[PDB]
Design an enzyme around this catalytic site. Structure first.
Site, short mmCIF file in Angstrom:
data_model
loop_
_atom_site.label_atom_id
_atom_site.label_comp_id
_atom_site.label_asym_id
_atom_site.label_seq_id
_atom_site.Cartn_x
_atom_site.Cartn_y
_atom_site.Cartn_z
CG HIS A 41 43.20 36.88 41.14
ND1 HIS A 41 43.67 36.90 42.23
CD2 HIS A 41 42.85 37.96 40.87
CE1 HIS A 41 43.71 38.25 42.78
NE2 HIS A 41 42.90 38.94 41.83
CD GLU A 62 40.77 39.16 44.31
OE1 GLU A 62 40.15 39.99 43.76
OE2 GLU A 62 41.64 39.22 44.76
NE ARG A 85 38.31 42.54 43.01
CZ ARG A 85 38.17 43.70 42.68
NH1 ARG A 85 36.90 44.13 42.50
NH2 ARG A 85 39.11 44.43 42.26
CG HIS A 101 40.48 46.25 46.93
ND1 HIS A 101 41.61 45.55 47.38
CD2 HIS A 101 40.03 45.90 45.89
CE1 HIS A 101 41.93 44.60 46.53
NE2 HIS A 101 40.96 44.76 45.51
N1 LIG Z 1 39.66 49.20 43.54
C1 LIG Z 1 40.80 48.54 42.81
N2 LIG Z 1 40.26 48.30 41.34
C2 LIG Z 1 41.21 47.31 40.86
N3 LIG Z 1 42.19 46.76 41.39
C3 LIG Z 1 42.45 47.05 42.50
C4 LIG Z 1 41.54 47.65 43.57
N4 LIG Z 1 41.97 47.81 44.55
C5 LIG Z 1 43.06 47.08 44.72
N5 LIG Z 1 43.34 46.54 43.51
C6 LIG Z 1 44.58 45.58 43.12
O1 LIG Z 1 45.25 46.20 42.02
C7 LIG Z 1 45.82 45.53 41.19
C8 LIG Z 1 45.30 45.78 39.80
O2 LIG Z 1 43.89 45.45 39.57
C9 LIG Z 1 45.29 43.89 41.84
O3 LIG Z 1 46.40 43.31 42.55
C10 LIG Z 1 44.15 44.40 42.66
O4 LIG Z 1 43.75 43.30 43.49
P1 LIG Z 1 42.60 42.45 43.17
O5 LIG Z 1 42.74 41.52 41.89
O6 LIG Z 1 42.80 41.53 44.58
O7 LIG Z 1 41.37 43.26 43.42
#
Ligand SMILES: Nc1ncnc2c1ncn2[C@@H]1O[C@H](CO)[C@@H](O)[C@H]1OP(=O)(O)O
Ligand SMILES: [Ca+2]
Ligand SMILES: [Ca+2]
Ligand SMILES: [Ca+2]
Ligand SMILES: [Ca+2]
Length: 114
Positions: A41, A62, A85, A101
């Site tokens: 996305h 990403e 990512r 994250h």
């Molecule tokens: N460790 C993690 N695993 C899954 N989703 C995460 C995550 N930390 C943050 N997110 C965010 O939580 C939501 C559900 O997955 C998404 O917006 C995702 O962002 P992302 O898609 O940019 O990783």
């Protein structure tokens, strides 16, 4: 910019092959089922995250950076993407960054891998 030999995302060290495989998986995404898969996305630059991209102009996407890749998950066959990512140029596949994250300043957001 060139896919780096390795990256350290919050303590998870990934190789160039892990990174390449993630981009490959993202580029191989097609339609399936009744909705888009969660990944790839769009990635957007957020000033507070202090992430520098090394590709040029966007758009950017990403995709999960995982061991034993590529990542794949779909509705009703969920697999956790974990925290790490690859950012790549949506259309060309060019490597832009590895982000995580883990240790980010928000729980939804990112910081650059090290
Ligand atoms: N460790 C993690 N695993 C899954 N989703 C995460 C995550 N930390 C943050 N997110 C965010 O939580 C939501 C559900 O997955 C998404 O917006 C995702 O962002 P992302 O898609 O940019 O990783
Ligand atoms: Ca370039
Ligand atoms: Ca290698
Ligand atoms: Ca798909
Ligand atoms: Ca930035």
């Amino acid at each position: 910019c060139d896919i780096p030999q390795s990256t350290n995302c919050g303590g998870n060290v990934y190789s160039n092959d892990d990174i390449n495989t993630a981009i490959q998986g993202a580029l191989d995404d097609v339609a399936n089922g009744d909705r888009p898969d969660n990944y790839p996305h769009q990635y957007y630059d957020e000033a507070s995250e202090d992430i520098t991209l090394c590709c040029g102009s966007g758009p950017w996407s990403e995709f999960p950076l995982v061991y034993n890749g590529p990542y794949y998950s779909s509705r009703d066959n969920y697999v956790s993407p974990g925290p790490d990512r690859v950012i790549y140029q949506t259309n060309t596949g060019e490597f832009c960054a590895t982000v995580t994250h883990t240790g980010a300043a928000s729980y939804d957001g990112f910081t650059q891998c090290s």
